[PDB]
Every structure is written in C-alpha cells, then in structure tokens.
Amino acid sequence: PSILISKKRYVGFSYESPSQTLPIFDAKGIETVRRDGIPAQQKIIEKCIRLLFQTKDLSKIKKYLQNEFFKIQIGKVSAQDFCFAKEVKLGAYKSEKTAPAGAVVVKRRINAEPQYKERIPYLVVKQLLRCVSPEFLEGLDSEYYINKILIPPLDRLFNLIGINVGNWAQEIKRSTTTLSFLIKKLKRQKEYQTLKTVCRTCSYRYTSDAGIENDHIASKCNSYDCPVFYSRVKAERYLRDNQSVQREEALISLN
Amino acid sequence: NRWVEKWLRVYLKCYINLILFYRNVYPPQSFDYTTYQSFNLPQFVPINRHPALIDYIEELILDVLSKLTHVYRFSICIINKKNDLCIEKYVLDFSELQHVDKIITETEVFDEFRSSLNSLIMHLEKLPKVNDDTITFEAVINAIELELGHKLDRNRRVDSLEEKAEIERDSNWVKCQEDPKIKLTSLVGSDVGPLIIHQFSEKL
Amino acid sequence: NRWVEKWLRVYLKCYINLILFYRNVYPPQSFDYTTYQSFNLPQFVPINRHPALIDYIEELILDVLSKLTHVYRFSICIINKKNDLCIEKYVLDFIITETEVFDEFRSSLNSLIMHLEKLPKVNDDTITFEAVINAIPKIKLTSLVGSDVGPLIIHQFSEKL
Amino acid sequence: MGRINNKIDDISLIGRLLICGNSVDFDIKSVNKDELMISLTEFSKFLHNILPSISVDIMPGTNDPSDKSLPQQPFHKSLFDKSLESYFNGSNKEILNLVTNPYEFSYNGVDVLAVSGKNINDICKYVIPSNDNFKDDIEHRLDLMECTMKWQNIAPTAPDTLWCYPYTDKDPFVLDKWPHVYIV
Amino acid sequence: AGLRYGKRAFVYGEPPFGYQDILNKLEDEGFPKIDYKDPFFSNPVDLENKPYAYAGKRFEISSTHVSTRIPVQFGGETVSVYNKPTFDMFSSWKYALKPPTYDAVQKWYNKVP
Amino acid sequence: MDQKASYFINEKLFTEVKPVLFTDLIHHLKIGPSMAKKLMFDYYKQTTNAKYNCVVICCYKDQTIKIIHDLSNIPQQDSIIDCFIYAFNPMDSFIPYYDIIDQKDCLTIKNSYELKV
Amino acid sequence: DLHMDALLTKFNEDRSLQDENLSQPRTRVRIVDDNLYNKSNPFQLC
DNA sequence: CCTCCCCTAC
Ligand code: SF4
C-alpha cells in the first residue's frame, strides 16, 4: 500500500524481503517525519494512515478522528503533544516582523540568550499567531489547534482518496449522585497518588532516600520532557479545582 | 413499554446464559457467577465474558424485544453438529404477554424471575451431561403477522443508526417450518401483572 | 409458474457460484465477494469476476430450465484430478405468488451457506467440477432445506465419499 | 444472634460487633454506581437484619468508598437503604455508629485503638536490605507493630499513608496516650 | 470406486478455464489479476455522498453493508421483487447469524487476555 | 406443629422453587431456633420421596462452624457439640437470597438499647 | 466414625427446647462508648 | 503575486 502526495512526499508499508511478515512504516516528507509541528499531529496522521492501509475502512478512521476531536474539545489531552519546536537563527532574520513565533518567544524571554540554531519550544496552548511558551504550565481554544494543525495535512492525505475531513470535524437522602461524586473523587485521588509514587521512585536516583524529603524534592522537578510531569501538574490543579464546591454539595446532601 | 423492556431483557439474558452454561454449549471456564452485567440480575447468574458472544446475545435480545409486538413464542434450540438435528428445545411462551397498553415495583418482578430461573436450573441439573467439542445452539421464534427479508426492495437509503438497525434486524431472519419420542416438561413462569410468561422445555 | 423461472435462475446461479467459491474449485480473489446480495441475505455472496465463466453458467442454467420437465434430478459433481473420482456431490431434486417462492429460495440458499461454511478446506489446483442432468462405498449424506410450498417441490442434499 | 450456637448464656455476652474496614471490594479505576449500589444494598440488608439484636460500629477501609488517605472520615448518612433511615436520625447512636478509620473506643473504660491496617501494609511494601536476623511471616508483622508502639508513631511512612494537611502543629498520628488494646 | 451417477445420466461440456489459467485469462481480458479492496465505508450511515468529486476526479466509494449491495443480476439485468409482500398468519422464523464457535472461545480463554 | 411447618416447607420447595432455611421457619411460625431445628429434622424424616438436597452444618469445639460437603469423612467427630440441618436446597448450587425481614417479635436476643424515633 | 444420619438423629432428637420463651428475650450485655460525645475526636478532619 | 522562513529529499 502506498500514497504519493507530491514530489519527495510519500508514505507506505515497506517489505524489504518476501520472508518479512510485519510491514515497516516508511514515510518520506510527510508530517510524520517533519519536525515542523506537534507530536499530536504526527501521532494522529500515523494512526490514520495505518488504519487506512490495514483495514481500508473509512468508517473506522472517521470514528477515530471524531473521538480525538471530541477529546481535544473537552480538554482530555495530554497537554504535552501540543508543543512546537523549530530552529531559530537570531541573526539571520531580515527584519523583526519577518521573525517566526519562536524568535518572538525567545525575545520575550531575553528581556537568558540562547545558542545558535536551537530547537526551542513554542506555542504550547492558548490577535495574530505572533506565542506562549510551555508560561502555559504556570498560566486552550481547541478549534484553532484542531483546524490549523490537523485539517490541512489530513486533507492533503485524504483528498487523494476523495473525502473531506472538514465535514467530519464539523459534526463533532440521595445515594445516586453522591456515589458518582465519590467515584470520581476517589479515581482522581488514586491517580494522583500513583503519579506521586512514580515521581518519588524516579527521584530516588538522586536522593537515594525513601521517607520524607524525597517526595519534597521530587515535587520540585519541572522537567518538560516527561509526560509524567504534565500529568502530575494536571492532577494537582484538578484537586484544587471546583471539586471544593462538589465537596460542599456532598456535605449538604449527607446532612 | 416503560419498564417492561428492561426486565424482559434481563430475563432473556439470564435465560440464554443459563441455557448456554448448563448444556455445555460453551466451556464452563468462560462463565463467571455475577449479579451485574450492565443490569442488576435477579440472582448470581453465570454470564459468559467472551465479547463476541456477549454482543451476539445482546443483539439477539434487542431484535426479539423489537419484534415482541408480533412474536408470541421464543425458542432456543440445541442442534448437534455431526447432523443438523435438534435434540433439546426450550420454549418461552409469549401469549400476548399482557402487553402494557398504558408499572409495578421491581422487587416482585425479580422474585418471580428468581422462581422461574430456579425452576429452569432445577430442570437443567438433572439432565445428562453434554460433551464439549462442537455442540451448538440455535434461535427460533414463532410469529403471528409479519414478513421479514422483504425490506431491501427499495434500496433502503439509510439516514441514521435507527434505520440501519431496522434494516439489519429485518434481514437477519429466515423462514423455517414447524419441524417421535418428544417429551414435554412444563416449567414455572412469571404470574406478575405486567408480565405473564409461560415456560416450556423439550427433550429427544 | 411465471416468476419461478427467474427466481430459480437466480437461485441456481447463486448455487453454482457458492459451490465454486466455498470449495477450492477456482482460486479465491477471483470472485466478487463484497458487491452483490443474493436474496437479501446478510452474508456475502461471491460472483466470479471472469465474464466468460458467468456466461457459461448462464447458458448452463438456461439449458437446464429448457428441459426442466424431463429432468427429475440436477446435480453437480466434484471430481479430483489424477483419480477421476467424485469426492463430493451436491444434488437438488427436479396458486403460487412472489413471496412464498422467494422465501423458500432464500431459506434453501441460507441452508446451503450454513452447510458450506463449516466444511474442511480444499487444496489448490486439485479439484474440477462436472454438472450432470438425470432424465427419466462409504457415503456421508447431508439433508438440506428445499422448497415445498410450490408445485415444483425440490429436495436439497449433499454427499461426501 | 444466637440462632446457631443455641447457648444464649455465651452469645448474650457479645456486647458489640466491630467491622474494621474493607466492607466492599471493587476496582475504583473501572467502576459505576449500579454495582456499588447493589453491594451497599446487600450491606444495608445485613445491617438491618442484625441491628435489632446487637450494636454495630463500622470503620472505613482501604478499598471502601472513602478517602484514599489514612484518616478516613465516617462514610455518610447516605449510601444505605431507606430501611435504615430510623437509625440515622441522630438520636440512635448507641446501636449504630459510623466512625473515623483511626479511633479510640472507650469500651466500658477499656481504651482500644483500631487501625484498618493501611500503615503496616504500606510499611510492608518496602524491601529493606537490613534486619538479617522472618520473611512475610506473622512474627515479622507483629514486630513491626511493636516497633510502631515503641516509636509512638502510628504511620512511620508518612509519604505513603498520610496525605496533605494532616493537621496544624499537632499531628494526631504521633501517639499521646498508649491504649489498652491495639488492633490492626 | 466413486459416487455413482444413477440409472440415466447426461454430462455437460467441459468448462473452458482451469485452476491455473483462470487468472491469466482474466488478466488477458483486461481485468487486474487480484482486485484489491478500494477504500469503503463499513457504516452506510457515514456514506453521506462523500465521493462526489475531488479536483475534477470522480471517485466511486461504496459500502459493504447489505443495504448498499446491488442484488445479484441474471443476464445483465437486475432481479428484484416488485409486488408488496403477502404475510401469512402463524409463521415461524430462524435466526441466520452464526454464533461464535466453541473452539474460538476455548482459544480465547487459553490465551489469558 | 409438624403440619403448618411441613406445608410451608413443601410450598416453598415445590410451588415456588427456592431454598428454605430454618430461619424462615423461625420468622414464619414465631418459634425459637431449637424448635425450628427440631421441625426441620422431623421434615427430614417421612421423606420417602426425596427431591431436594439437605445442607447440614455442624458446630465444633473452640467455636468453629463448618459446612459439610464430603458427607463421608467428617473430621474430628468427637469434638462436635451440635449438628443440624441448615436448609433444604432443591437445586445443586445453594446460593440463597436475602431480603428485608421484620423481626418484631421473633428475636431471641435483643440489645440493651431501643430504637428511638 | 458414623454416618451423617446417625449424628443427625443423635443430636436433633435430644433437643433441649428450653429457656426459649421468645416473649421475654435475654437482654444483650450493655457495652458503652465513653467517646461518643466527649470532645475533640483527634482524627476528625474537614 | 510577492518575499520570508523552515527543512526535507537527492
Ligand atoms: S521527571 Fe517525570 S519522572 Fe522524573 S520525577 Fe519529574 S515527573 Fe516523575
């Protein structure tokens, strides 16, 4: 199976030997191998291409795309796969207005200076496009991300078949409620505890300690290259979220 | 049809799962005793955990519930695979079911279901053991005024999932006929107001 | 006795194509499997892609129905190469409106599909067929569903050496 | 209730019944309200059928629908059948009592400290390359509990059992008075 | 040795193609040797007349559902029922879908998912 | 009474197929546990047509309660302090069901406190 | 040492049937909790 | 339509 988009742009399953059983996902020039985007678009494109090549089913692709779009709109994304990274040349720009978004982010950060030809994180989440750095975590309009990150490449890949992805995206005493409240709160608390345990175990590498002052040190880690940090900060924010009002509602119902 | 559909679906699920388990239609290791299978069962009914079998049973029960307005008898036939002959037949009478034209507490409904399922289990226990290795089951219904397989003569351009479900349910049945030492053993059904169900069984 | 001709033609075409595909008489990926519906059945009915074989089947069906009165048994035999022995043999014996003849034809086709789906696989390039018309060792026989409402009652059964 | 033993002279001496947690077992990762409600209705049926003959004290457990931390508050007035609404009016506390997970009952002057066992279980999930001179034995856990009394710290592994904000300047988990009887 | 034909039996002509020459003959006629599956919708609801056109190219995207499948045609002309169905009282019907095999369930259980 | 109890047991065992407990007799006839056990033993006799399974449990020493399964080799028979019939099971799997029971006047032991409304 | 029927006959036929008036049931021994209302449950948080 | 910028293929 193969798709030929344009010159030096193609993707397909490769069989280097007839004895080989599992196909190899070979892509050249499409967004999967291009570092000019976000990991979410690469993962979505790869999954859609694999589904099309294996099952040839457009219904499964549409279902997966609609589910992913709904998750993005709701806000159930990992928040890490939405970070851009492009090289910046601080001295090779003709003018200030011609500089890219990452140059503006670095210039705001300087006022510290980076090195020449650096992949720098830009446009994490949430009026020209010219720039929040991953200021987001200490700080998303899903329509913008969905449309201007997934509609163009998926349309380029699927208009060859003859389907419009944009049409798919266009559609897009009480023991009952309190029990659900406890279910949600306990699931959130257990997830938070698991994240804290993982962080403590990872920080054991440096601390070599198990009791107190190990979790305290692990709580000060701000590594942006690991999804566990994003999950931990999301859980911590959610514990301090509107759930306080939910707890008050449970107290009123219980009384 | 307010609460009748849910209780009827639960009873049909328990009936089918009990018949499958006690006649060795599927390996007993694939069954587990439980009370919740997306619905609070009246007892601890052994329910298979194979996703394909669960989906098949749910689809069959939904089709039967959809056609309930015209079917007066539901039967699960046990047919051998060395030869296409039915050896055991379990008949679930639906003599107008006392249809709710216009509804009772769930406790009595579950008590009656418990009595009927206990009668079924007691009858099934004394039956001789059935070997594994390709014993299978079959579903047959007796209708009053309907004709299936004839809804695909207009190209049936579907618009929503309901139309597709109707088309696939109309075309999922084929016409059969009525067909020694047949032994008939009547069992205990439900005598509650909304649900009047009679239970039968056949041997040989 | 008017529409029985067309419905029998369709049923016989489905019969022959199903026997040719489910058995390994002709290779797979040579039949049209995901395009046609036989008798509004939910299953996939295969149709041979080569127009010449389809035309030959149609001529065979027309010839069979031309002398339908004289024939009392129409059968298709499966012959294994280098032995010339009938491994298996599928035989069908011989006021009516649309609905009933349609229904028994649908039921007979469904029974044939059920019987054929659970058969053991057949090796490649080892089987050829032979259609025989009848005018007037250890054998395993299987009884299938046939039409009975119409005056042209047929009996469907299969054999296996 | 004395229905089985048939010796009332000994059954009538059992003043109270104490449930020490883990009333219901479920997977909180994948769970819905209906099956948990079925389990709680069964528990409520048992309570209603046992309450008229004996008093019941209930403790939250590790897998019970209560806080994941160790100081688990009493369950609720809800999550029980409507047949038990008479016991939850507030005036009837001597026959039914829902209590915090760690508690000190003064049973006729006998102060007893009850723990559902989360602290010892959390200590036992650590492998310590020390104490060469028992492996997963009753003696080893008994020694751990004896050390817990010796250290006057109910929860030595604070990051595992304790949660954020146990208290302000006075942690209740540090012992202030030894009890007569210790239960884990 | 083999199965007897009967008392009086006639034989039809030999088929023109064999097992090995069928694909070559099909390729000679102008058809691909293997017809690979085109992109399709398994759910007829999701059809929505998508394959209309794409940059002046007309695509034929169909569905494998029973509703969208063309009835089997004889002689180049489609065959279908025209009159309304006539239901008869006291009929019996049989489920057509095949339940999962005992061996399939045993294999699924032994894999320990 | 050996007549009302037998009729109730026969009804609950044959008309509505459900296992019958001795506690059911306690709640129905308003009798003590010993009388219920004696009535169950009496119904165990005069049973030439046996169409049910008896679930018998015994009380060992050191306050141990066991359910008999083997029915051929009972360990420590010398330490048995009591042995009676717990229930009559018409099926093979016991699996009883429990419902709300109003123990208004069938209680043999009551707590010192009373429910206050 | 004996069949189950022998044990059942030995035990059930000699039932006491005594002290079971059922009209004046034996009162359970009184056990109280002095901490029901005293003060300051240490583990009661908000 | 124009330049500017990114960066992958060969
Ligand atoms: S970096 Fe990722 S893993 Fe290492 S501690 Fe911070 S979160 Fe846990």
Author numbering:
A (entry chain A): 1187 to 1297, 1302 to 1316, 1321 to 1324, 1327 to 1330, 1332 to 1336, 1341 to 1373, 1420 to 1502
B (entry chain E): 2 to 103, 107 to 183, 195 to 219
C (entry chain D): 2 to 95, 107 to 148, 195 to 219
D (entry chain F): 241 to 373, 388 to 438
E (entry chain A): 512 to 624
F (entry chain G): 1 to 117
G (entry chain F): -2 to 43
Copy the relevant paper text.
We present here, at a nominal resolution of 3.05 Å, a cryo-EM structure of Polζ with an A:C mismatch at the primer terminus. The Rev3, Rev7A, Rev7B, Pol31, and Pol32 subunits are organized around the mismatched duplex DNA in the same pentameric ring-like architecture as the matched complex, with catalytic Rev3 alone making all of the contacts to the DNA. The structure shows how the Polζ active site responds to the mismatched duplex DNA distortion, including the loosening of key protein-DNA interactions and a fingers domain in an “open” conformation, while the incoming dCTP is still able to bind for the extension reaction. Amongst the various hydrogen bonding schemes that have been considered for an A:C mismatch within a DNA duplex, the DNA cryo-EM density we observe is most consistent with a “wobble” base pairing, in which the N6 and N1 atoms of adenine make putative hydrogen bonds with N3 and O2 atoms of cytosine, respectively. For the wobble pairing, the cytosine base shifts towards the major groove by ~1.2 Å, and the A:C base pair as a whole is much more propeller twisted (−17.8°) than the G:C base pair (−3.8°) in the matched complex. An open fingers domain creates space above the nascent G:C base pair and many of the van der Waals contacts observed in the matched complex are lost, including those from Leu1087 and Val1091 of the fingers helix αxB. The dCTP is anchored loosely in the active site by inter-base hydrogen bonds with templating G, and by the contact it maintains with the palm domain, including stacking interactions between its sugar and Tyr980, and hydrogen bonds between its β- and γ-phosphates and the main chain amides of Leu979 and Ser978, respectively. Of the two metals “A” and “B” observed in the active site of the matched complex and associated with a two-metal ion mechanism of catalysis, only metal B, a Ca2+ ion, appears to be coordinated to the dCTP triphosphate moiety.
